[PDB]
Ligand binder design. Structure first.
Ligand SMILES: Cc1cc2nc3c(=O)[nH]c(=O)nc-3n(C[C@H](O)[C@H](O)[C@H](O)COP(=O)(O)OP(=O)(O)OC[C@H]3O[C@@H](n4cnc5c(N)ncnc54)[C@H](O)[C@@H]3O)c2cc1C
Ligand SMILES: Cc1cc2nc3c(=O)[nH]c(=O)nc-3n(C[C@H](O)[C@H](O)[C@H](O)COP(=O)(O)OP(=O)(O)OC[C@H]3O[C@@H](n4cnc5c(N)ncnc54)[C@H](O)[C@@H]3O)c2cc1C
Ligand SMILES: C(#Cc1nc(-c2ccc3c(ccn3C[C@@H]3CCCN3)c2)sc1C1(N2CCCC2)CCCCC1)CNCC1CCC1
Ligand SMILES: C(#Cc1nc(-c2ccc3c(ccn3C[C@@H]3CCCN3)c2)sc1C1(N2CCCC2)CCCCC1)CNCC1CCC1
Lengths: 485, 486
């Protein structure tokens, strides 16, 4: 029998398994449906992040940024045969595939060289409070390969893309298939306002063949809901400046195939659009339907997530749940932190719970976003006096590069009673790297005075965070006003 | 012409002090400088050395140089074009760089024109008496007087100047001032000096050199970038060598002569020789005290050459102050800004503030760049009983695909191991200058190592390495380097 069985060899499942086995000598089993990236199941050993998430996403955005580099280099005297330029999508994917497969292999080797840490290929599910069955397929009636006896069971199966119930949805893809398109689409429509749709819009915009067009549609008025609103409006503009068509207050109603294999999209508003690819990126839902949670009584939240307490425990004793399946912060480092904290509490004498506040995240759009803490309108409903410090500027190089539209935005939100910084929001190149150390600042409850009394590093964009001393406006009892009464 | 404040030197520190005194405390301010825009004959001008012949132009040209790597590295991500058609136009880079600096010059002139009690005077300032700044047509005390500015307070803020060694043929060499206006990119160039100016210009010249070119950097001691973390000093040496730059350590030029075609014949103290088209001296910058007539009123200099000041920027003469490079401490623009702002708060706002010169974050825009804040381990070991070093070094994944496998990232955290306080952070790699900024805020808060690795990381970034080091790589006990503790 195993001290612990983990269903899902992803960001959270692997941290919890490795720690419990190497730090505490416990006997661990880990189940995943594949050993290497790709169809049919896309995610595999490593998790969504390694196989069809952060890692290949970052590589493909890097590749897409070269479209700007090539164009901007002329402002600094560089020339080359523009007509010979080709963005070879098939080589990008091949390089991504080999980079991901290398990670797949190293995790494979990890299991083969760690005693007390074993991997089982198959589909895991709950047969009882103490048994995880491994079948050949997600079908509960498929052949059994294993029945793992477990003193503790960890649910860490991640999440799965959400798809709307419209006629012709089968002709639409999600981010999973976008990583494996054999050719770069000339015309693509990304559906959604979230970070996945924006990031892939930039990727497709760079590698599209001549005559191409990337359209992004969103059912409400402003994309990237949940991010700072100044950044939301500015990123919309800068995407438009780089050729992406942003189509707000629109939503697909049906999709049919044209005689050439392209898709005819009809929107609820009657508008129509023909594209080669339609990528649904309207949300990620917890991946629970294959686990047979009813066999055991694991309760879910109203919106489909596995309900846990601040220590990641389900209502069933000795059954825990971490990561995206809990439907809180769908971030890789969070799932790692929840995995490590769980094992410390269960297999050690050090109870530890992960802080889900003041977590720094990023969006690798072109231009990128970096954020940590509360946006202002949320803070306005939680604090009596709120100050907003805002600063927009054109970085030095973009006065020469030919990309004047690349304005950098820095915003700081404080509790104005004592100047405690509640949120920092950045837009512009470098923002993802700038914001990491800002997260450390907010654990230490840094005040605005701690930022503008720190001496800047010149010339940097991050310098701006230490150059703001006077609020641009306030919120008192939830009311926006420039000057205080 | 009775001013509250007269500033000699319209630079980084001088401009901050004059603007604060005028706009925040309604004081009448005069500011003196020798030009209103960048370039010859005097190079620095309205805006200072940073705007005109320092950080700002330096940065734009390094950015242009980085496109040599971008264009090569793009192939790994599927980008295809005619490699043989790639050319770098140096005159376009200079021309574009001049436009951007002049826009800053123009902007500053409009600030003076539109702000009450903030007047600009063109000429050369100097001390006539304790309360009189005289402005002449040239730096020569015999040149004609333009104004005598009556001043209740005087601020010395003239910056620094490139130091040129007294070797035969020095007249055939240049400094960084002239490098910003070279009509052509040198095919062969020798940057003399191991500091950040020489390293950064090596990167620039390496990217824009015509075919068959070579950049050589020489330094009289064994390892370049003294003062920085030793690991990073060695890695940048490797990564400069990896990008084609010959480093020539333990060598120092002894003379320069002219060849028939106009090139320079360099003879080193070791008897070695080298032929280059340009010799750029960047061995140091010295405080610019020679034209101020400090002896007239008796402003004292330190044993080192800078204007002696107490922690509130006050000189030995009452109502005369000095900030910035002329005080010859940390020759950084943001420090001169901070010193100038603290000076005005103290003098005019009865708000006594002084600049903290410790834990200052700074950068080197080498390719790849450096970001640093706080102490290096050698210095912390002489100052703390138990010291620990957390170290992580690796080639990022993107640079495996890009083909630049030599671009090893380096993160190092130095701590006082007795309580875990972070004493210094040192970075090498893309984004290091941007990462290190908020690290200065962390060190201002006396952050501890645990504050870093208990912060949730941002993935995937280089910065998140700073939050995933929790076990020291080695220690310094009583100044002795060891891997494990006793
Ligand atoms: C396109 C995209 C980009 C992203 N970019 C980022 C980013 O930049 N930064 C970031 O922090 N996060 C990002 N995320 C989110 C991140 O990938 C997840 O938050 C992260 O994987 C944490 O999830 P987890 O560890 O809980 O589960 P995962 O890491 O998803 O692992 C779940 C694993 O369980 C397996 N599994 C599922 N069901 C079963 C079953 N029945 N039996 C056996 N195995 C099963 C799956 O194959 C999978 O490998 C991105 C996600 C996507 C889709
Ligand atoms: C090539 C180079 C690159 C650099 N890069 C960086 C960097 O990346 N980051 C950074 O932080 N720092 C950098 N520095 C340093 C930075 O430029 C200086 O530390 C900063 O400009 C000093 O400001 P200051 O106020 O002391 O005087 P300065 O800014 O030097 O201004 C002094 C001014 O006084 C004027 N002046 C001189 N004598 C007289 C007189 N008799 N009468 C009237 N006016 C006079 C001059 O014309 C000059 O404009 C760099 C310096 C150089 C040379
Ligand atoms: C990694 C890794 C890693 N590689 C290991 C490993 C690697 C190789 C192994 C073994 C055991 C045997 N081998 C084979 C030997 C040793 C290396 C090659 N040959 C173990 S163990 C390991 C770690 N765990 C794996 C699952 C998550 C925790 C993560 C890194 C710290 C050490 C543990 C990359 N981390 C980046 C992520 C993205 C968010 C953080
Ligand atoms: C700056 C600035 C700045 N511009 C000002 C300014 C600029 C223009 C002004 C006035 C007052 C009137 N004008 C003219 C306006 C312009 C449009 C209409 N008329 C004031 S005031 C000002 C500040 N300092 C004053 C002395 C120089 C720095 C810094 C920014 C906050 C305000 C003061 C940074 N420039 C970027 C480069 C990168 C290295 C430096």
């Amino acid at each position: 029998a195993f001290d612990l069985v983990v269903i899902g060899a992803g960001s959270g499942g692997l941290e919890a398994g490795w720690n419990a086995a190497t730090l505490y000598g416990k006997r661990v089993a880990v189940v995943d449906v594949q050993t290497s990236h790709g169809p049919p199941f896309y995610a595999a050993l490593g998790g969504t992040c390694v196989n069809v998430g952060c890692v290949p996403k970052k590589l493909m955005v890097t590749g897409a940024q070269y479209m700007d580099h090539l164009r901007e280099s002329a402002g600094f005297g560089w020339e080359f045969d523009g007509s010979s330029v080709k963005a070879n999508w098939k080589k990008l994917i091949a390089a991504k595939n080999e980079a991901v497969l290398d990670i797949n292999k190293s995790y494979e080797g990890m299991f083969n060289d760690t005693e007390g840490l074993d991997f089982f290929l198959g589909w895991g599910s709950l047969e009882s409070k103490n048994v995880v069955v491994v079948r050949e397929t997600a079908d509960p009636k498929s052949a059994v390969k294993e029945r793992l006896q477990a003193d503790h069971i960890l649910l860490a199966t991640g999440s799965w893309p959400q798809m709307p119930a419209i006629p012709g949805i089968e002709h639409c893809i999600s981010s999973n298939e976008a990583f494996y398109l054999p050719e770069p689409p000339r015309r693509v429509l990304t559906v959604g306002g979230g970070f996945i749709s924006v990031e892939f819009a930039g990727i497709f915009n760079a590698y599209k063949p001549p005559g191409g067009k990337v359209t992004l549609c969103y059912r409400n008025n402003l994309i990237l809901r949940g991010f700072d609103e100044t950044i939301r409006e500015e990123v919309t503009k800068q995407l438009t400046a780089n050729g992406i068509e942003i189509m707000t207050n629109e939503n697909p109603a049906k999709v049919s195939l044209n005689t050439d294999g392209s898709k005819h999209v009809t929107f609820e508003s009657g508008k129509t659009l023909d594209v080669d690819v339609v990528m649904m990126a309207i949300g990620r839902i917890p991946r629970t339907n294959d686990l047979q949670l009813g066999n055991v009584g694991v309760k879910l939240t109203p919106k489909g997530g596995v309900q846990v307490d601040e220590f990641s425990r389900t209502n069933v004793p000795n059954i825990y749940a971490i990561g995206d399946i809990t439907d809180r912060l769908m971030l890789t480092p969070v799932a790692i932190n929840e995995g490590a904290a769980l094992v410390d509490t269960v297999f050690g004498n050090k109870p530890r719970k992960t802080d889900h506040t003041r977590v720094a995240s990023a969006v690798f759009s072109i231009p990128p976003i970096g954020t940590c803490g509360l946006i202002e309108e949320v803070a306005a409903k939680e604090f009596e006096k709120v100050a907003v410090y805002m600063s927009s500027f054109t970085p030095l190089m973009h006065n020469i590069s030919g990309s004047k539209y690349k304005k950098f935005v820095a915003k700081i939100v404080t509790n104005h009673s004592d100047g405690t910084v509640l949120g920092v929001h950045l837009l512009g190149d470098g923002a993802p790297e700038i914001i990491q150390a800002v997260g450390v600042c907010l654990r230490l409850n840094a005040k605005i005075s701690d930022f503008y009394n720190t001496i800047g590093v010149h010339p940097t964009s991050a310098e701006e965070l230490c150059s703001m001393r006077t609020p641009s406006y306030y919120y008192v009892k939830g009311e926006k006003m420039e000057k205080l009464p």
